[PDB]
Design a protein around this nucleic acid. Structure first.
Ligand SMILES: [Mg+2]
Ligand SMILES: [Mg+2]
Ligand SMILES: [Mg+2]
Ligand SMILES: [Mg+2]
Ligand SMILES: [Mg+2]
Ligand SMILES: [Mg+2]
Length: 156
RNA sequence: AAAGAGAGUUUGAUCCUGGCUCAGGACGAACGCUGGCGGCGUGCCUAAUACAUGCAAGUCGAACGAACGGAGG
């Protein structure tokens, strides 16, 4: 299946000679606890329509998270735009410590032991983009062992 | 083995930079409302300002000076 959570909704405007027109832009993070997660944005005159459009957008750009032993294999840093998110492994039973959007994306991804810090701006969309970007350069022991032509025991 | 949570605020709406404020912990603490008990601790942070009253450094007859029972008269 696919579970979704709403992050934020913002009312944006645009000026015309007859006044102004407003509409809502909604950010939605979808994912399942198997290790798949994604984010999306929607825009509509009504909030539920924006949520539905954001969900449909998020369903099209899913990614995967390596979650060996329910923990990030190694620390990484995202760098998208003006946001910075640092993710590092945590011990078993430590829970998840993160900011709002980062907590949402990590919880929907499926990880249970990870600690993160925000080192940049606090704009939610840039925070989510930075978190996903940091998730990009994750690694698995088997994959790097195959890349370097050796076994896991030799590498670890 | 250890390993870090953010929020509000400049705009008609944005994205950055930047300051201000708040969410936590600790006192030899003080003030306000209130107040049942037990154990263990702490109590002039200011005037090293001025001091009633009492006690805190004396002891050795094995180196040289006591009343009584009591020799004797
Ligand atoms: Mg797009
Ligand atoms: Mg505040
Ligand atoms: Mg009191
Ligand atoms: Mg009282
Ligand atoms: Mg008591
Ligand atoms: Mg003193």
């Amino acid at each position: 299946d696919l579970e979704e959570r709403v992050v934020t909704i913002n009312r944006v405007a645009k000026v015309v000679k007859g006044g102004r027109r407003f509409r809502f832009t909604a950010l939605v993070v979808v994912g399942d606890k198997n290790g798949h997660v994604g984010f999306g944005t929607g825009k509509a005159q009504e909030v539920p329509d924006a949520i539905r459009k954001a969900v449909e957008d998020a369903k099209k750009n899913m990614v995967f998270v390596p979650t060996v032993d329910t923990t990030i294999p190694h620390t990484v840093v995202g760098h998208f735009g003006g946001g910075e998110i640092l993710l590092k492994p945590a011990s078993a039973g430590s829970g998840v410590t993160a900011g709002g959007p980062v907590r949402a994306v990590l919880e929907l991804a499926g990880v249970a032991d990870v600690s993160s810090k925000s080192l940049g701006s606090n704009t939610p969309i840039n925070m989510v983009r930075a978190t996903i970007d940091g998730i990009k350069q994750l690694k698995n022991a088997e994959d790097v062992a195959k890349l370097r032509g050796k076994t896991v025991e030799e590498l670890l």
